[PDB]
Design a binder for this molecule. Structure first.
Ligand SMILES: *[C@H](O)[C@H](C[C@@H]1CCNC1=O)NC(=O)[C@H](CC(C)(C)C)NC(=O)[C@@H](NC(=O)OCc1ccccc1)C1CC1
Ligand SMILES: *[C@H](O)[C@H](C[C@@H]1CCNC1=O)NC(=O)[C@H](CC(C)(C)C)NC(=O)[C@@H](NC(=O)OCc1ccccc1)C1CC1
Lengths: 300, 300
């Protein structure tokens, strides 16, 4: 038992990170097959693709450790550079590129100079930012989930907004949210709490022996949603309730009783008590995250 | 910027996890060179020396993916079994076996049937437990730190105590804390807060822009101590103050002044405010961890 913020194991992603140097800018790249994916602003109100046509293949130093990968061709797909190199990465996992939805979580392998520094779990916030940990040179670090043996890359890091939150793209180069890879003013937008995740985390708490917050008040999805709007919570939908099925069925607490639990926590606070070692309602565990961890799902 | 609970990348440990089955008991083992380390209760108020002498090398199916490893010897060092096998692990990294002190952190690569499930950080609490995430079948999972390219193995899991906390050994088989690997009633003992860690996380907060908790008050080492023991915080030594020097100089906040901040936080609480997104005072970040995350250090 116990419950912790758990990342995927990152060896499948570690074996892909490369350093991409161009001019006096260095950042990270993702080497899959004979392609290196990286943020286009390594070539830097830019006209990126005017700036790209003025580039040559030999202008791009790609270093997989202490071995120089040589670029045989390049193209730009939205906000990512794709660098065609002369070597297939023999450590290329089975992979896909996916675009995650907000509320969904993923592991970030933060890198600098091609080298993995640490791994941690993030959620895509409702305002299309992530609360990451990223310094100068961490761009090109990827987020990912694993299913069985296949890596689903969902995030690549590009920028930090003034409120200390982070913004990036999928591996197709399209930003999450209304951000651009340009050093002009832009703000994260107001965030909201991922309600379905909070409820998932309360189930996890029950599955682990935290029941002090429970009651047997019930509620309707409509009455609950009136309260969710009052406290800056995302609306709860019947689809959310459905995904919460397995969790409810394992604990014996109907979704709508646990929603009534959430409501009393929202109106009365937690009153000096902690849930799973936290004094706040945690919203970065999906239902799938709860089920995987509380049942020991592993990955080949 | 940002500060999140960050694990070492796990791929060097991933290449060393195997499945160890004996009788009907399966748990995880660590395969370095031609030796597989695992919890000794895999051969299970027993008598382990008697139980071991009754075992043959063929009783141990050590299973590495789809490559059965032939056992060709065995021995018991305290609570760990050492299974010499006929193949040296080609993916053996540079490694060390270290016994860590309380307050020190490490990453845990939770595993099941020799397959990684996730990675996360933990601290050796002062009562020699850890607050992990471990189910049936997770024994043999290791805790570790990474330095340049060297894996310092420091923990191997064995058991969960009734409070939901977790107990284990170093890789020389010696338990942390008074605990024994048998189904005899044993409780964790009273835990305390790692004061030096809380102060380091206060600095992380400062480096990341949370200053609301600071003040111009100051204190003596003993006066702040007089307060820590009131609140179950552990003594702060002058050795700890020294270790906080780098953080003190980078922020220009003297440690005894940060102690004054923490003192005020202990006597008044957080009163609705968060620090680094927590409403409790976090103690599972060492000064190391802060400097490494807030400066970006990597691992080849
Ligand atoms: C890639 O290594 C870095 C990562 C940044 C640096 C520290 N933390 C990070 O996540 N990315 C950048 O340096 C980008 C470069 C561009 C903009 C993608 C070309 N710059 C930023 O992250 C800057 N953010 C920014 O420009 O956001 C909009 C903004 C808001 C207010 C005033 C001006 C601009 C920020 C580091 C300076
Ligand atoms: C190895 O896979 C497991 C890991 C445990 C299982 C659940 N979570 C974990 O971290 N280890 C065990 O099953 C041990 C086996 C021994 C005792 C180490 C040989 N058993 C336990 O963890 C059990 N706890 C226990 O025996 O603690 C002492 C105790 C306390 C109170 C009353 C009696 C005994 C418990 C999981 C079943």
């Amino acid at each position: 038992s116990g419950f912790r913020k758990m990342a995927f194991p990152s060896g499948k992603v570690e074996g892909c990170m490369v350093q991409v140097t161009c001019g006096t800018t260095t950042l990270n790249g993702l080497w899959l097959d004979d392609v290196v994916y990286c943020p286009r602003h390594v070539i830097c109100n830019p006209n990126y693709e005017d700036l790209l046509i003025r580039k040559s293949n030999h202008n791009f130093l790609v270093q997989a450790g202490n071995v120089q990968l040589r670029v045989i061709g390049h193209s730009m797909q939205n906000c990512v550079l794709k660098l065609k190199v002369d070597t297939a990465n023999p450590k290329t996992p089975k992979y896909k590129f996916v675009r995650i939805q907000p509320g969904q979580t993923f592991s970030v392998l933060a890198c600098y100079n091609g080298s993995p520094s640490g791994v941690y779990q993030c959620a895509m916030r409702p305002n299309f930012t992530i609360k990451g940990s990223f310094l100068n040179g961490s761009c090109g670090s990827v987020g990912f989930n694993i299913d069985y043996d296949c890596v689903s890359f969902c995030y690549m890091h590009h920028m930090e907004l003034p409120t200390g939150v982070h913004a990036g793209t999928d591996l197709a180069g399209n930003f999450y949210g209304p951000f651009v890879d340009r050093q002009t003013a832009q703000a994260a937008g107001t965030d909201t709490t991922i309600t379905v995740n909070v409820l998932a985390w309360l189930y996890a708490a029950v599955i682990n022996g935290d029941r002090w917050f429970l009651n047997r008040f019930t509620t309707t999805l409509n009455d609950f949603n009136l309260v969710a709007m009052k406290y800056n919570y995302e609306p709860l939908t019947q689809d959310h309730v459905d995904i919460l099925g397995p969790l409810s069925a394992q604990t014996g607490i109907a979704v709508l009783d646990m929603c009534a639990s959430l409501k009393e926590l929202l109106q009365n606070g937690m009153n000096g008590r902690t849930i799973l070692g936290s004094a706040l309602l945690e919203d970065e565990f999906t239902p799938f995250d709860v089920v995987r961890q509380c049942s020991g799902v592993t990955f080949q």
